[PDB]
Amino acid sequence: VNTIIYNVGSTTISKYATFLNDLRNEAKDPSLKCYGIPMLPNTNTNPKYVLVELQGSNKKTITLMLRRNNLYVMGYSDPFETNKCRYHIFNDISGTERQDVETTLCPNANSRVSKNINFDSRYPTLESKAGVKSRSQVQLGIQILDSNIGKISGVMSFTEKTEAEFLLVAIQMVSEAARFKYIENQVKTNFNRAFNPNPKVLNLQETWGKISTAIHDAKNGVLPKPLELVDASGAKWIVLRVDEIKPDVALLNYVGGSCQTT
Ligand SMILES: Nc1nc(O)c2nc(CNc3ccc(C(=O)O)cc3)cnc2[nH+]1
Known part of the structure; x- marks a missing residue:
């Protein structure tokens, strides 16, 4: 699995463009395309995933795990405590995919820890956790994403609202933007x-x-x-x-x- 690294703490629009460009180039099927637009790959195509390391400010980083077939975020991880890798799998992930999120995000089985995302990735759920009737009420923006990363990355306890807010913002500036x-x-x-x-x-x-x-x-x-x-x-x-x-x-x-x- 490959990871696309994006410095959220220090960027320009050309870097953002390059980021998405790299995530699209990596996510897309090397040949599938309808009307000149690249198509994601069939679920049987390997690799099945792609990572997105979001490097915030103050050494706060979060890595997103995306399924290549539909570009959905399956979960995320963050550096935690000492040599720890805290993975958070969406609750709508099932079967082998849940082992795939854990092992793909945190390869070192020895130092990885779990912190489940106790809800699914559906916008109405995320919006509900964020405490908003519509994600239109949750502004998007570079400095905002950076700030949401910092509220989660390395912090032992954050609320579902704080978590949902990060998710909402990251999902839209990453996969929706791609x-x-x-x-x-x-x-x-x-x-x-x-x-x-x-x-x-x-x-x-x-x-x-x-x-x-x-x-x-x-x-x-x-x-x-x-x-x-x-x-x-x-x-x-x-x-x-x-x-x-x-x-x-x-x-x-x-x-x-x-x-x-x-
Ligand atoms: N990146 C990403 N990651 C996910 O895990 C994900 N999951 C979903 C399913 N749920 C939803 C819910 C609401 C709406 C909507 O209100 O338009 C669309 C999709 C969609 N989009 C998603 N995008």
Whole structure:
């Protein structure tokens, strides 16, 4: 498994771009692509994971473990106490995958410790733990991510709110930013400040699977049926072609079957 290292304590937008660029290049299937957009790989493809080491300020680091097939965060780890590696697996991880999060995050079986994420990765759960009806109320931003890392990295006890807040922010600035060019650009336009995720960034996150299927199944560039998304103002946004949603998409969820590759 490879790890993409990103210095959150000291960056520029070009470094952010390079980061996502490296995570996409690593996550994507070396050949799967529909309409010129890279597609994630089939679950049987190896490696099945990719790590993202987030280096905050004050020597506070957190490593994220992502599944390559759908870019989902399965858990995270942080340097703890002396030679310890504290892994936190999402509660929606099951079977062998739970051993995979533990061993892939903390290879040294001798010094690794467990600290379970007692809830799933679904936004409504994360939002509920963060104590917000919508993640739109939790601003995203570099300095913010850095600050959330510091509240967890090495700290024995943090609340589910503190934890959910870190997750919400990290999930969107990492995997959601990698999945969508639009989301990356939003972060870069507000690189030096805190910003609330707009209706389009959130909708994109919620309709990624549909968009990916729709584009995979697209005929000549025509979406099987009209896809109803929402723009930045929160207005209805009906897409009929791949050219209309493609600019905002960097990676497509793995969708089984052949497709118009270009
Ligand atoms: N990076 C990452 N990691 C995960 O573990 C993860 N899990 C999910 C499932 N849950 C959800 C819940 C709500 C919505 C939504 O409200 O749009 C979309 C997906 C989605 N997106 C995810 N992204």
